[PDB]
Amino acid sequence: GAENSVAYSNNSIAIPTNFTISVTTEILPVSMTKTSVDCTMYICGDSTECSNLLLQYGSFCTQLNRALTGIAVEQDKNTQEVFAQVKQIYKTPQIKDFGGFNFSQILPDPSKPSKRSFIEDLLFNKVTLADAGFIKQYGDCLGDIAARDLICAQKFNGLTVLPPLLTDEMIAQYTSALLAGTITSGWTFGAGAALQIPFAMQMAYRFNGIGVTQNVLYENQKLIANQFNSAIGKIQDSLSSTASALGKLQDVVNQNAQALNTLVKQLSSNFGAISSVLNDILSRLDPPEAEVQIDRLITGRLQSLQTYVTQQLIRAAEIRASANLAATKMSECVLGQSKRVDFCGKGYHLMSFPQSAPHGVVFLHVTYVPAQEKNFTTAPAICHDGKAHFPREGVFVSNGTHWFVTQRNFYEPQIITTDNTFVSGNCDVVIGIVNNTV
């Protein structure tokens, strides 16, 4: 990284005189493709004698399907824990006078059949979902000419993809209710009923929650609104062109698809048997002699299923961690304003907007991110009347011969007064002190 040696200041300060409302974007997986595995269809296919061999071999696949069912139920539970959030389904606030803030591309439009916003549209376009997001029917796999697809092979080999319980449109409805409660109530709907509030003044309160008083907003309101709109448009364009929406979500989807394809392609492994074609074994060896090779194949395919389920459990542990993080960010930045540093954006968090994405959620973190720094000279506990004075929500910075008690994160110099500075302790005990004021 760039060397940025900052000159330590025994008596000087750098107060940023101009901020930058930046809409950072993060992408969090919330769920993974839940799958079901058939015991005999994968291990044996359509064979009565191989089924008997797998029956006398053991009962592994009841445990395997129990693990996979637990994974699927946890996927639904993660989706409830993040998207479901508030059950009260708030509809779009037709009154759109939000003080300049637009939300046009984040709040859904009824024009298109699906109540999915345009940013959500770009997100759903970017993630390919080339494995399970599309709808494939049994008639499609039954009738084919060129070559049997990967998905047809998985279906015919006992590998099925169970659809998520929450449809994408009702996921968008959860996100629309969250957005409506955020742009009409803000955060009060995360505790009880939604408490309506005009967006501008809850925005001012969200500044109040980062140490920047509301004196900033109503004085800069048009600039604030236009800055947020420009940021949302810029991230919209980058999402349209940079393909950054892939991120973690495309990696998760490709991971699941590649795991399923590995499971299918690993049916061609011999595992020490004469061949991986179970029917060639069954059509060339007597049941005694064929039992050795079929038991080798059963052990190999059972190990393949066990490995598949083992990294499915590990991947579901990762997905559950990310979904707990997504629920924490949903209930601490969409239902409130997190005071944790760098939890919901690089700068000082203002709010967040949930956006549905394939097997995940996108957070548009609105952050303060001050800039346009300016060196001043600072000295605490000014000595007036022989007593130290300390700045209540102030810094005691100086202009030329003029000392101003100043807000932390925004250069708004003000004159020293007793209703803004509190006195305690004799002066001269404090190390860096200077009065010449009040």
Ligand X SMILES: *[C@@H]1O[C@H](CO)[C@@H](O[C@@H]2O[C@H](CO)[C@@H](O)[C@H](O)[C@H]2NC(C)=O)[C@H](O)[C@H]1NC(C)=O
Query: Binding residues for other proteins, per CB under 8 A?
Result: 36, 38-41, 45-48, 51-52, 55, 59, 62, 65, 69, 76, 84, 87, 89, 135-139, 142, 145-148, 150, 153, 155-160, 162-167, 169-170, 173-174, 264-265, 267-268, 274-280, 282-290
Q: Considering only CA atoms, which of 35, 239, 31 is closest in space to residue 124?
A: 239
What does 54 bind: ligand X, a second copy, other proteins, none (CB cut-off 5 to 8 Å by kind)?
Answer: a second copy
- Whether 33 contacts 154, CB under 8 Å: no
Candidates 227, 229, 256, 356; binder of ligand X (CB under 6 A) is: 227
In the complex, least distance from residue 84 CB atom to a second copy, rounded to whole angstroms:
6
Minimum distance between the CB of residue 253 and ligand X, rounded to whole angstroms? 29
Query: Closest by alpha carbon to 220, among 363, 348, 368, 337?
Result: 368
End-to-end alpha carbon distance in the chain: 45
**Partner in contact with 210, chosen from ligand X, ligand NAG, other proteins, none, beta carbon below 5 to 8 Å by kind:** none
* By the rule CB under 6 A, 369 interacts with ligand X: no
DSSP H helical segments within 143-242, as ranges? 150-156, 168-184, 199-208, 217-241
Tell me: does residue 146 bind a second copy (CB under 8 A). Answer: no
Number of residues that bind ligand X (CB under 6 A): 6
Handedness of CA 137, 139, 142, 148 (dihedral sign): negative
- How many CB atoms sit inside 10 A of residue 291's CB? 18
Residue with nearest beta carbon to ligand NAG? 400
Smallest distance from other proteins to CB 157, Å: 6
Structure tokens at 105: 């591309």
Out of 62, 63, 167, 230, which residue is the one contacting ligand X (CB under 6 A)? 230
Residue 115: CB minimum distance to other proteins, A = 12
Helix or strand holding residue 403 (H, E):
strand 403-406
Alpha carbon distance 51, 156 (integer Å): 16
Indicate left, alpha or beta for 58 from its phi (over 0: left) and psi (-120 to 50: alpha).
Answer: left
Binds a second copy (CB under 8 A): choice among 46, 49, 58, 402: 58
Among positions 104, 208, 214, 226, the unique one binding ligand X when judged by CB under 6 A: 226
Query: Helix, strand, or coil here: 292?
Result: helix
Nearer to other proteins (CB atom), residue 275 or residue 311: 275
Residue of 377, 401, 255 lying closest to 316 (CA atoms): 255
Q: Are 189 and 117 in contact (CB under 8 A)?
A: no
Per the CB < 8 A criterion, the answer to whether 230 and 8 are in contact is: no
Q: Which residues bind ligand NAG (CB under 6 A)?
A: 7, 10-11, 97, 100, 102, 104-105, 137, 229, 373-375, 383-386, 399-400, 402, 431-432, 435
Q: Kindly state whether residue 433 participates in binding ligand X, applying the rule CB under 6 A.
A: no
Partner whose binding site includes residue 148, from ligand X, a second copy, other proteins, none (CB under 5 to 8 Å by kind): other proteins
Q: Closest approach of Cβ 376 to a second copy, in Å?
A: 10
The answer to the question of residue 295 lying near a second copy (CB under 8 A) is yes
Written as one letter, the residue type at 240 is: S
| 36 CB-contact burial (10 Å; exposed 0-12 / middle 13-18 / buried 19+) | middle
CA torsion sign for 396, 401, 402, 408 is negative
Q: Which is nearer to ligand X, 227 or 337 (CB)?
A: 227
Binding mask 186-225 for ligand X (x = CB under 6 A): -------------------------------------x--
Contacting residues toward ligand X, per CB under 6 A: 18, 223, 226-227, 230, 372
